[PDB]
Ligand binder design. Structure first.
Ligand SMILES: O=C(O)c1cccc(Oc2cccc3nc(-c4cn(-c5ccc(O)c(F)c5)nn4)ccc23)c1
Ligand SMILES: O=C(O)c1cccc(Oc2cccc3nc(-c4cn(-c5ccc(O)c(F)c5)nn4)ccc23)c1
Ligand SMILES: O=C(O)c1cccc(Oc2cccc3nc(-c4cn(-c5ccc(O)c(F)c5)nn4)ccc23)c1
Lengths: 114, 114, 114
């Protein structure tokens, strides 16, 4: 899986270990092996939510399967929880786009997963 | 909705009020409540369009509904118009990816919209 | 087409000519005209692959057509090869999301491609 979070929170508020924490939690939530989970945090961004510059986050999770109604609700609770705890971002100022990707549309290691 | 614009235009050349203007314009164009519009501008980027580095922009709009043939044509004119006036980027050096997202695939406030 | 690469490799390690190289290698791989290829490189990123912060890259390619099983395998070999050669990133730490976009959902030059 690939997880990306963009936020207006400064880099200084991103703790040591945050990328590992995201990796960790996503591995268990998805049941995917952690060595295949990529994570990307992008702080200090010029962004607004509802026209307000208070802390917010715009995120994506791409996965081959393990994407669905109930699963995405559980990921949103998990990710909003972490963003609130570690970055002090209110859950109602977080958006996450989920993508169930076809294996043929994911490149890795000179090939694709199909 | 979520709107992102990535550009090689420098930060200092992004005029003040730009995020608020995008927020309001996207609200009226989509008919979505402005409270729920998120906008993100990423200046100073290392990018090329047709292999040249004159000003350009790479954008995306995600929405649950309000996406379609005629709407996307209208959005593209509106957004290219704004980028041209504010950031001085020619419309022929702007791309916008539109995504009609399923409510189940959009996380927010500890849950999804489904 | 639109190609984005985000990496933790430092900006100084991105060769002059890299954006041009991407543009023309993709032009030939996809058969799309290079004047319509947009490329975006984002160095110095906070990211991990498998929880490790060794060099890695997270990429996407959006195109109207020229996306499929064999083509995407070929693009992956090509892009991993380029990233290995120029950025010294191992192919097992590269991910590429491929998107076959509907022409109605790609904005350009005040309209869409539909
Ligand atoms: O075949 C084996 O022996 C073996 C042993 C250990 C691990 C292994 O790899 C895997 C096992 C199970 C699910 C796996 N899922 C993935 C996987 C990767 N994605 C994924 C990554 C990035 C994206 O941008 C994306 F859209 C999807 N989604 N799932 C990769 C490897 C897996 C395979
Ligand atoms: O339920 C209510 O009582 C109520 C009252 C006031 C406002 C309200 O919120 C809404 C009303 C109508 C459409 C709405 N659409 C959205 C909405 C959000 N997206 C959206 C946001 C981010 C993305 O990445 C994405 F793919 C889609 N697309 N639509 C949010 C709130 C809405 C709901
Ligand atoms: O057919 C047209 O409407 C048209 C109009 C003007 C020029 C033109 O030149 C072309 C000839 C052949 C393939 C072409 N492909 C493209 C093209 C652009 N994309 C493309 C760009 C960015 C994206 O984010 C994306 F999802 C797709 N995918 N294909 C553009 C122009 C082409 C094509």
């Amino acid at each position: 899986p690939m997880f990306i979070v963009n936020t207006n929170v400064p880099r200084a508020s991103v703790p040591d270990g945050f990328l590992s924490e995201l990796t960790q939690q996503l591995a268990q939530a998805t049941g995917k092996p952690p060595q295949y989970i990529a994570v990307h945090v992008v702080p200090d961004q010029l962004m607004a939510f509802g026209g307000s510059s208070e802390p917010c986050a715009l995120c994506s999770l791409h996965s081959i399967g393990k994407i669905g109604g109930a699963q995405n609700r559980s990921y949103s609770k998990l990710l909003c929880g972490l963003l609130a705890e570690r970055l002090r971002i209110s859950p109602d100022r977080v958006y996450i786009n989920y993508y169930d990707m076809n294996a043929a549309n994911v490149g890795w290691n000179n090939s694709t997963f199909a």
